[PDB]
């Protein structure tokens, strides 16, 4: 791993030391270099640790004067990479580019060094083990570092721009994957000035990504809005206002399957949501939402509520049966029992329950007939993790459907215990209405920070509560096991004492007391310590920790709410049949423009 | 709508393209223009999409050199607006003003273009569909944009300043309705220098608004205090202090009905409250309040409290009657009943109740005899929405009066159920005392932010509570319907279980337990989840959301409290007879000034 990378770099620094020819290279001891060049029997194709030549050493330590004499030593040395593992294709041209010495690059080009040298090393790959990704070809090394004349010399001496590598990246691909510099935009415009016609913009990678969609999914918006200015068009300027229009053929990608906008919203980096505030893209989603999205979304929520109330009233009128067995037992309350199947359907009230049950059991299966093909499309963790896409809301409803399917099988076998799996689905179905709270302005931003705060702090409080409840519960169970439970019904055995301490921790039950009789001695001294450590420190610090997290993450939840309505917007028009979805934008075919779609916008300024 | 405005602007840009004469106009292809002007059979009164001429195109695209030759083409083209819908009166003078080209305006005036061209288009109106309102006449277009020599040329060649339009606005009206510029004040002083005598300041609009009241209701206080400096008068300066006085005839408007101050406080924009902190207006309302308003307001509140306690003690001694019917029913408590009318008045204690009831029923009608004429004066939403004017306080008291009138009709018919409408009026009458809490310093600012916070967050919490209570209440009702309600009186049927879960959500009732008998199994596991999701997450996040809203809106509620005492001040002296309201200010008729009223103020500075 990293340690293996350490050991080889330690190993190289003694191969550079033992050879005096190689040592005088890095030390610029050109007198001894003249002495060894006066010698003939000295080998010149010597190697260090990793396939080395002296030219790599001279390029690393920037002693060009020795590198001059190394050409008349052997001119063939400039046409050779290394041979060992991490630097398997690296030539001295790459080091000369990365050290910015125009004269030495000119001298290497004078010896006819191969411009198209392909260097695919271990360090030359996008990796968290690595720190720097500069592409693969020396054009990429020239463009990333910000030189301008060296790439002119390369284009002068070949250097085909349409050059692919591992992962199928281009020069314009790797220019996007950089920290922000003005030099990146300048070199982008410079290379676009040289290459002209197909176009370079159409080629994807091995992942199938155009550079426009690459810049979209990464989110260098400075490059993005500069790139779109080649496609804008002003209309007319008069007074302080200005009419203009944009092309949206590249933005929509209607005929394709992988749309641009869905690819943007299905990202992993945090900065990808920031690109949505650009002006030609914000107006499209706003015009789409405020015309079609809100009415199409407000309607079916009422249908879902109408489904849930019918499910609830089906769950109410459950067939019961009087208990035939005599109970005859203290600490026992059994008065009813479950009716069998063959007695369950006689009345007209029974006949109502058939169509009550049938609507629920047919609403169960359409949940699985809606998103199970969406499971195999995107990744599994790429379907559950995204809070923007509504992560846990999709996983709770499929469990609701699984439970309501399981109880129908349970009814057919006359299996007892019907109530127990039914109650989980009953409590989760009304929690499932929370998904529809997104499309409301006053309610939407509120219901996501609670989801944040559960996985932020509820476990933190929960582990600490569970470790502190146990010894107190054990102590209260020990200190009453010589007593009558008829007078103190709490703390009778261990498991109900555990629940009693849990209820008393949350200040729900009152403190137990029987003033007619006597109490044990140390109960009074062990209870007050639990009281002052539980009610005064735990919940109050929980409130105090909640208050700061609400205050500091108040800004991100504001922008994050409008960041997820567009996911619902692109989701709804993806699954509904598009005769209810006419095309947004202007069809310019009625004006002789031809097969392109546009959006008009004006802007007052100054 | 907006899309209709899109389609016409798209349509115009092909009519400009198809005509080569019109295309060479916008492209300044003056060689082909010389070719077509050498032609005679080519039409010169050609039209584009919307009543167009080539001069509009030349003025839009600022190619004056073609517009020179267009005059010798046809000089009559400079005297023609368009004919279609949105630009129905627009002439090239307006575009020439809005593009600021003095030579082209001079050339159009050389052809005798009509200065008083009236352009009333669709876009030329105050509308949220529009973005820019620049008045109607070319004087307004000159004044809004900030030119100075062009309006001198217009006044040189006519351009009557007293010019009305749609909505009856003047130049000084539309200068107020602008974003803040020093140029607005400069052009205001410039036009005031030209026009001098009646005066221009006296004319209203069709709404009946002087420009002074317009600037008051809008609140460009930079223009306001600059405008009042023409009416101030310094008295004497000696040392670091300075005596002066102001005229208040325009501010008071005593003889009129629509007063300036009430028109200011009955606004809709948020910035209109800011004008109250100006120095000649703050001293007037402070001198008025601290002398007359507070004593006149503190007195009748005690009378209202004395009314309410008499109403309460009338509600206590209600005529009862022993129940004649034998109850004989478990789960039933009926021991008293209602006395009839003919038995209700025999005693002297009954005789006290007549004059107890009569004061209440005559205090009922004077509420309707106080503000029902104020309903038809201002708008209905303009009477209920303003929290400054006390919105819901007026609507609760009229319901109180309606209920106390309805119960008197109910008593005359011996109708049962008298207590039920009585209790609503009983609980609302003591809530109605909250209106009088405005005039106290330590109490006033506190009682308005609660009104803010109800409609801010109580509904947000209420929807979320109502959606989460239902499934838990249904689950607790299902899990006990095989049991004895004699041992657990909660959760017997559905509707009392719904209320029991509501009380247990607010931690009012303790958790139910009967240690002598056994519990169902899954009750213990379903209760703790509701406990940790209800008592630990809902109310605590409600507190945390309350704490930030109290902190961030703490500043606006401070200034807003003194913003509403002046509404009470102008309200009280509007309805009381003015022999208890002598005139504020100084009557300068005793000093030979003559029929004007003044206020003295001094100012220490430096």
Features:
part of a larger assembly; 2 chains; 606 residues; mainly alpha; 2 domains; four-stranded antiparallel beta sheet; two-stranded antiparallel sheet; 5% strand; extended; metal-binding (chains A, B); cell membrane (chains A, B)
Strand order of the largest sheet of chain A: 1-2-6-5
In angstroms, what is the radius of gyration of chain A?
37 Å
**Biggest protein-protein contact in the assembly:** A-B, 68 and 59 residues
Number of domain modules of chain A? 2
- What is the general shape of chain A? extended
Overview of this protein structure:
The structure is cut from a larger assembly and holds two copies of chain A (606 residues). With 606 residues, the first copy, chain A, is mostly helical. Chain A folds into two domains: 1-278 and 584-606, no CATH class; 279-583, no CATH class. Chain A contains 25 helices and six strands. In chain A, the strands form two sheets. In chain A, strands 1-2-6-5 form a four-stranded antiparallel beta sheet. In chain A, a hairpin with a 2-residue loop joins strand 1 (233-238) and strand 2 (241-247). In chain A, helix 2 (20-27) runs parallel beside helix 4 and helix 21 runs antiparallel to helix 24. The longest helix of chain A is centred in the middle third of the chain and has 38 residues, at 279-316. The first copy, chain A, is extended and about 115 Å long. Chain A starts with a helix and ends with a strand. At the A-B interface, strand 1, helix 16, helix 20, helix 21 and helix 22 of A face helix 1, helix 6, helix 21, helix 23 and helix 24 of B.
């Amino acid at each position: 791993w990293e340690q293996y990378r350490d050991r080889v770099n330690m190993l190289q620094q003694e191969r550079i030391r033992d050879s005096p020819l190689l040592q005088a290279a890095k030390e610029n001891d050109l007198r001894l270099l003249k002495i060894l060049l006066l010698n003939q029997s000295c080998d010149f194709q010597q190697r260090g640790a990793v396939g080395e030549t002296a030219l790599h050493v001279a390029a690393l330590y920037d002693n060009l004067e020795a590198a001059t004499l190394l050409m008349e030593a052997a001119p063939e040395l400039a046409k050779e990479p290394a041979l060992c593992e991490p630097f398997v294709g690296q030539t001295a041209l790459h080091i000369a580019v990365m050290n910015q010495n125009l004269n030495l690059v000119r001298a290497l080009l004078a010896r006819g060094a191969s411009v198209s040298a392909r260097a695919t090393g271990a360090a030359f790959r996008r990796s968290p083990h690595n720190l720097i990704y500069y592409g693969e070809h020396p054009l990429s090394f020239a463009a990333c570092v910000g030189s301008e004349e060296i790439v002119r010399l390369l284009i002068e001496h070949g250097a085909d721009i349409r050059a692919q590598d591992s992962l199928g990246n281009t020069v314009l691909h790797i220019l996007i994957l950089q920290p922000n510099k003005t030099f990146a935009c300048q070199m982008y415009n410079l290379l676009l000035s040289y290459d002209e016609h197909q176009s370079l913009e159409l080629v994807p990678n091995h992942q199938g990504l155009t550079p426009f969609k690459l810049a979209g999914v990464e989110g260098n918006t400075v490059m993005f809005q500069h790139l779109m200015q080649k496609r804008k068009h002003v209309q007319w300027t008069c007074g302080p206002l200005t009419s203009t229009l944009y092309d949206l053929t590249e933005i929509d990608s209607w005929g394709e399957e992988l749309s641009f906008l869905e690819l943007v919203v299905s990202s992993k980096k945090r900065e990808a949501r920031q690109i949505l505030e650009q002006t030609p893209v914000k107006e499209l989603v706003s015009f789409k939402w405020k015309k079609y999205g809100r009415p199409y979304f407000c309607v079916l929520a009422s249908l879902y509520i109408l489904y849930m109330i019918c499910f609830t009233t089906c769950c109410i009128y459950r067939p019961l049966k009087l208990r035939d067995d005599n109970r005859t037992d203290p600490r026992d309350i059994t008065i009813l029992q479950q009716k069998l199947l063959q007695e369950a359907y006689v009345t007209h009230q029974d006949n109502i329950r058939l169509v009550g049950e049938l609507v629920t059991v047919t609403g169960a299966v359409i949940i699985l007939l809606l998103e199970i093909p969406d499971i195999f499309r995107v990744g599994a963790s790429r379907y559950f993790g995204q809070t923007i896409l509504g992560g846990p809301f999709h996983v709770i409803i499929i469990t609701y459907a699984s439970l309501v399917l399981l109880t129908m099988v349970m009814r057919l076998t006359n299996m007892n215990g019907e109530v127990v799996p039914l109650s989980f689905a009953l409590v989760l179905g009304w929690c499932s209405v929370m998904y529809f709270a997104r499309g409301f302005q006053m309610l939407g931003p509120f219901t996501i920070m609670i989801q944040k705060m559960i996985f932020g702090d509820l476990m933190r409080f929960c582990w600490l509560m569970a470790v502190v409840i146990l010894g107190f519960a054990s102590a209260f169970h020990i200190t009453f096991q010589t007593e009558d439970p008829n007078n103190l019904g709490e703390f009778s055995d261990y498991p109900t004492a555990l629940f009693s301490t849990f209820e008393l921790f949350l200040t729900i039950i009152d403190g137990p007391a029987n003033y007619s009789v006597d109490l044990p001695f140390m109960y009074c001294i062990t209870y007050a310590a639990f009281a002052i450590i539980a009610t005064l420190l735990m919940l109050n610090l929980f409130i105090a920790m909640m208050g700061d997290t609400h205050w500091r993450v108040a800004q991100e939840r504001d922008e994050l709410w409008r960041a997820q309505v567009v996911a619902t917007t692109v989701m709804l028009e993806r699954k509904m049949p598009r005769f209810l979805w006419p095309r947004s934008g202007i069809c310019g075919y009625e004006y002789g423009l031809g097969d392109r779609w546009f959006l008009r916008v004006e802007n007052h300024h100054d």
